[PDB]
Symmetry: C3
Subunit: 259 residues, 3 copies
């Protein structure tokens, strides 16, 4: 519950109770820090940025500066961060753009290791882990319980569904359906995130999913056609709905499988 005297804090910023601010932090006039937020020394918060309860941010992280994108034109956008997040040293996160969704959103209980960059208009859920140097291009969507290995680059508009695991040093240019593990320069699906499914899903449903994907990724009928048929033959099945609707909504297309 201490605010360093050396910290520069705009009188227009809103700092709730219990907030800790380390030495030399720089806080702009559009920042909001909810209860229990802890900023180590030298954190830079600019733009219209909201930082949720109990989130902790380490030294030299930069949040809220304008997107790097050239299309940006001093637009009115926001950066919204959830609760119980851990944001490490040298992270750089920008707010959204008018051409995107006018915001960059991050949920709860996530860990963004050092040197992680989150570009404008990205959406990250909860319980995610982005390792050292992960680089997210613009307009990316990441579901809950997603792990992305260090030094991985995700291209613009890519969508990663819930429970996915992406190996380090990968370059992902396509969407990844729920509970899949990805790896490779031009990343592709190598199987299912068994370890994740085992903690969130029941055995019976895990088997169903394997079967589902095996049928979905058959070569003959296109993925799209198999997905639509899957929704018909199983109008009542949460997993089919979650997986198939994700697939049919894909813009960049779904990543390569193995069959």
């Amino acid at each position: 519950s201490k605010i360093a005297k050396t910290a520069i804090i705009s009188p227009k910023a809103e700092i709730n109770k219990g907030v800790e601010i380390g030495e030399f932090c720089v806080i702009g006039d559009g920042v909001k820090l909810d209860e229990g937020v802890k900023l180590h020394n030298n954190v830079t918060l600019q733009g219209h940025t909201f930082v949720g309860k109990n989130t902790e941010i380490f030294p030299f992280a930069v949040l809220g500066t304008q997107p790097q994108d050239l299309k940006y034109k001093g637009e009115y956008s926001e950066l919204i961060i959830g609760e119980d997040n851990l944001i490490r040293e040298f992270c750089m996160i920008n707010p959204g753009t008018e051409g995107g969704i006018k915001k960059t959103l991050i949920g709860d209980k996530n860990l963004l290791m050092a040197y992680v960059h989150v570009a404008h208009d990205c959406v990250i859920g909860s319980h995610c882990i982005l390792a050292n140097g992960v680089t997210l291009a613009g307009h990316i969507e990441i579901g809950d319980y997603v792990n992305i290995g260090g030094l991985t680059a995700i291209h613009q508009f890519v969508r990663i569904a819930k429970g996915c695991m992406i190996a380090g040093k990968s370059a992902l240019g396509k969407d990844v359906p729920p509970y899949c593990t990805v790896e490779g320069n031009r990343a592709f699906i190598r199987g299912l995130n068994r370890h994740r499914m085992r903690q969130l899903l029941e055995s019976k449903d895990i088997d169903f999913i394997y079967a589902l994907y095996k049928r979905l990724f058959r070569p003959i009928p296109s993925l799209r056609e198999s997905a639509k048929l899957e929704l018909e033959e199983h109008a009542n099945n949460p997993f089919v709905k979650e997986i198939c609707s994700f697939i049919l909504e894909s813009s960049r297309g779904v990543a390569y499988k193995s069959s």
Copy 2:
């Protein structure tokens, strides 16, 4: 037109009119900031560094500290940056060395995204874009209108000519002739930067270039011999001169083509 009171500025530094300096900037005694320069909070400028008109530098960038090279011995070198540049967060740029060209030079209207490192003795032109984490080794030369994708590493003494495009995550160890696109770990030429040529060149000349490269990269006569012959059969043709003289001057050799 405001200079933060918390900023540390050597009385020997030269700060022109209209310069903006954010909170906690550290400016050494050999720095010069031309008109309209904007430094966000926490920018570090050391050594004999000149920053051109209207250039803007974001938080935690470090410019002017001594090169990492071991051969360096407290030499007298400079870092010269042009006008209208955008230098993002966490960039690190060093001045030259006595063994090199005694300076690191950057032209105008360039964008160096976050975590970009420019080593000693590098030369960057104008209208260039270096994405997140691009790493330039020493003595590199980059022409105008060059785009280098994120997380790409360029090895020492490599030269990239005008209008080239280098895909992200590449490792370039050879020179790249004008208007070529490169990609791959041990990077190679995959074709021409059509999108770039279309905005700078006329259709007729674009066709000529394709033809030129097709003949230059034939397997039998060496690239060098074809280049010399090309200069003979076309003593009067700017494109041939620009492309062939570049090739004949190569030290590390020209990158692999595809034919």
Copy 3:
């Protein structure tokens, strides 16, 4: 021998004579700086960190903050750095954990270039060079005279013996025996670090080592069996002892060779 007035230094920290501290440095209550240490502006030193004589640390480096590892629980660990080290901009080094060796150790005369991250429980020797962006996972052991190229990632528990060279952009998941050169995504041994051996070893011994490895890496008898036999047929030979005992102690296994 000057300490910037703007620097924040805990009265509990121990600062020896001749120490230089730049503007805005942040020094916690468990830090110790031995004689001749030079901190540029904005260096952050936290936790129970010791910095040896004459070590120099550049702007925005962060040393001593808690490990990123989730298993960590406000444990009592240390970060110990040796003498004559050069630690560049944006480096991030964490102390050890209770599950590891309760410390992160770095020897003497090393150069850690910019953006280098050293995870909890790592052990680095002396005369080493880690290029831009090298990322070390936890519990890694690096011997003396090791060079690791830029943007290389070393996985947890990997051990690199004395005199090894690791090419840039590699991903190492296995141990590397003394005097070997490694390269590749899933890194493997490509030969010997001749350049290194030539400065530290006599010609006769260099020949012996080549022969040793040629016999060790034969396909039929396992590496382990050949190593044990090598120790028997040469109970008195420092090189055999150094190389073979390293191999037999491997946890993650030894890297792939080429024969």
